[PDB]
Amino acid sequence: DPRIRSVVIVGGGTAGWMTAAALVQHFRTAPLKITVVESSVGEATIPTIRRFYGQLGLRDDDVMRATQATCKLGIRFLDWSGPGSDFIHPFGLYGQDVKGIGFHHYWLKQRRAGDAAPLAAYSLGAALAAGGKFTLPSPHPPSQLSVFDWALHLDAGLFAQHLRAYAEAGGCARIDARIRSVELRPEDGFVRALTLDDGREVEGDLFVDCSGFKGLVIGEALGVGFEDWGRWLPCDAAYAVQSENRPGDAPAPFTRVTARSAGWQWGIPLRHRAGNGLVFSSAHLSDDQALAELMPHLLGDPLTEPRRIPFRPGRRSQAWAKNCVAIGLSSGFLEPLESTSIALIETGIERLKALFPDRRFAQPILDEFNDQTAREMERVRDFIILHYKLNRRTDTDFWRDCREMPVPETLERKIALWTARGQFVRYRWEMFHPASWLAIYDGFGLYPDHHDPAVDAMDPAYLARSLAEMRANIADLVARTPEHAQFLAGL
Amino acid sequence: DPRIRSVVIVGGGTAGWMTAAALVQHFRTAPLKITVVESVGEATIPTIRRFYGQLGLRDDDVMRATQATCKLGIRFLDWSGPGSDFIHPFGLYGQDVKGIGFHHYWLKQRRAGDAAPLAAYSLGAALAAGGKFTLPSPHPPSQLSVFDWALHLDAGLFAQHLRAYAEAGGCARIDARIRSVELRPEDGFVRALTLDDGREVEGDLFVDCSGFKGLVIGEALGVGFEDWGRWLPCDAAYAVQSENRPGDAPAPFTRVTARSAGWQWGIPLRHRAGNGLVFSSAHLSDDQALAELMPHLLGDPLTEPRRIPFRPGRRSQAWAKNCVAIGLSSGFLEPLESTSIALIETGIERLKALFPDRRFAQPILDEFNDQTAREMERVRDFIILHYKLNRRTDTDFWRDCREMPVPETLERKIALWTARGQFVRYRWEMFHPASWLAIYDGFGLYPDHHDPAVDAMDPAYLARSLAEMRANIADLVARTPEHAQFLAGLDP
């Protein structure tokens, strides 16, 4: 029977144990052996992660308790447009669409006629994040204005441990062991087995490489190459360090992303601790200069000294080769500017299930998986690039260069249709939907010349009052919502 | 103010008056002049009910005015050999489970000996086969009760209804032949139309609804044509209206019957029907064509058949300078899957979403041109598939269709379907995965292996869940009124 009989996941962490837990649930009562092989820090996410553990039978409160987690309503971008600049990228839409026309067009008309209200006054998500508030969104919500979503700041290590215990209870084997070698079949070149340090062999029909950046099976064993993207993205290094919260420091329901002289700093709040880091260009900063930016501005008392991490932006040339599928860092890397690492694991897993193979490993299945994965990486790359491309900082060469650097043609087309007409070019496999593009356009102050002319038919007095009603509903709803701290105290 | 001040629509019919009515509603109280300049049974997809929906019109009023009947899908007869019979509905099949598509569970059971057609799990299809009709529920218990519906209608009457709508909102109308198109000297943009009497009709924005010749997009502006006869064999058609015989209840579906070298259509109106044969002249003479068509009409012919040249393909760019082409002026695909009116609708929605100013910014044209091109290609490929998968042995026409090369975009779809039972998704598909499924199943092409999470389920448990679904539909159909009752509530 051509049926896959066994799955061997090479590496634990988030990638390995998310994969194990997801495959355990999906194939719970089927005759499928699943085994992980591994040896004996704060992170952000997007809302997809709540659905991921949702599908496993897990609750938000239980996962949050176990992972030292806090709520994430969006990301806060500080100083990207010059000293004091400040906007929030939320999970939600702005305002209410009318007659099929997007809200932002009516907002632009009114902005043209003198009104100075920020686009963010019409997003409940963003207003809640700025107010240090949190509440669960209503399902079957009164109207479009009250729709927002939310995600987690969490300990990735704890998250990995929680999913491990979940996977093992459903019958996933675990082998604590270093791997000496990967053995290939000499007719096919397919992966036959892993050889452990003690000489045991671990055979499998399907291998998932979660070994990390090195790529032990997809790269070293099978020779799959790497598409380097350093040419598009300047930054090439990072420092990270956990901090301990100081007494009377209420963690905020957002991630802080603060632009510095030659890169940017992150701030990921957990319940009693926080993730901190600086991403930067070594060609503009020494190691001591980097620490001089990072260390005086942490969200708390450092727990250790900073570790350096090499960044190498890009993607594995094919994420699936023969009978190896690469999930997580083994399949590529983009900096955490928009919290996408775990998200790329989630999409990889959903795709593996949607295209799960048999032992013939039919070439069209690999081709489709490889094609989706490639386009999706490129669509996230382009969103990340945009942030640098539209900066308005005058203070260093790093930032001028980012503003004048060439960018992929796919992003040129997006930027060009936005400034010409206020519309969105839509490709396949976008992680980020139109409202997220809008948040970045508006955050960097780039607006179209021409809004949609059906909008100029509306009366400026009538419009002005519909908008003030929206603006007020949000402000007053925010005002009466409890603080983030109260939801955390109930965990 | 760079604002468009005026719009001139060149040609009436469906393309011209759908455009006028849509732009009248969308720009109702704006200072925008709109003018049209001008001098048979058809099918649609459900988008058309939304189109006139957005205008403030009701299904019953439009149906009364257009001699219309209900359309639940299309019925394909004899494409797989004598007696073959399947329906492409507007709906999904069965109930998806645990994120896995219904068709995988159906395939597992089919593997184990059960012979129930995939169509037994579509309410839409079951209602069409049963000669039944009912409005779908607005807030339905589950996926099993969800279907949509469209119209068979008189296109001429539909054009007249929209004309009266457009004129009441302030659209000018000029009855006149056009002598020439005048181009402006710096830009080469269209300045004005010159009429037979010498009047000029000026505009900032021109819409070419002139038909196949392409008076502005083609003749005036020189935009070329991508011919697609290489991919699609048929190159001609005959159409003829028929009068219903007494005691002939029109069916709630379109009939598409394969013949020796092409196919016949049958579009029922309330007291009349559209009929035609699409075919390859390289395999059939004109008299051979009429010998297939004329003995098998849905009634007494109202005239003699007119021939129509078919030339499948698309205008190279649908928008050039300040001319947007809508309808036949932008391209042509045969009505195998009822897409003509649908392509006008998508063109109009796109024009509104990308409505320009007088600078005619190049990125707007480029996006419009790109969307339009891809969408035409996605409809072409769906049409091609129908010929590619035929199982007819009786003529050379049909062997060739089965062995003909097909675009790479379609090769990839067919390859992932047979390998894994999954759908390659491109941008701008008019037809969603369930429609592809209907064609794969109708021509008997199924994957080698279904999704293996499905084999976790017990064959006895599965067999009974499926028989319950199969029965819920059959019993819902059984108690639903006939098509005729809904039509009597529009009529005498």
Author numbering:
A (entry chain A): 6 to 45, 52 to 502
B (entry chain B): 6 to 44, 52 to 504
Quote from the publication.
Flavin-dependent halogenases (FHals) play an essential role in the regioselective halogenation of natural products such as chloramphenicol, vancomycin, or cryptophycin. Only halide salts, oxygen, and the cofactor FADH2 are required for regioselective halogenation. We were able to show that the gene product forms an active enzyme and catalyses the halogenation of free indole in C3 position. Interestingly, BrvH possesses an intriguing selectivity for bromide over chloride in halogenation that, however, cannot be directly explained from the crystal structure.
The structure of apo BrvH without any bound ligands was determined to a resolution of 2.5 Å. There are two chains in the asymmetric unit with no major differences between the chains. In the crystal, it forms a dimer very similar to that of tryptophan halogenases like PrnA or RebH. BrvH was modelled nearly completely, except for a few terminal residues and residues 46–51, a loop involved in FAD binding that can adopt various conformations in other FHals and is disordered in apo BrvH. The substrate binding site is only partly conserved between BrvH and RebH. There are no equivalent residues in BrvH, as a short loop (residues 432–444) replaces its much longer counterpart in RebH (residues 440–467). As a consequence, the substrate binding site of BrvH is noticeably more open than that of tryptophan halogenases and the ε-amino group of the active site lysine K83 is directly accessible to the solvent. The lack of side chains to keep the amino and carboxy group of tryptophan in place could potentially explain why BrvH does not accept tryptophan as substrate. The openness of the substrate binding site and the absence of large non-polar patches–which would point to a variant B halogenase–resemble the structure of MibH, a tryptophan halogenase that chlorinates tryptophan only when the latter is part of the enzyme’s cognate substrate peptide (deschloro NAI-107). The structure does not contain FAD and there is no halide bound at the assumed halide binding site, the amide nitrogens of T351 and S352 (T359 and G360 in RebH).
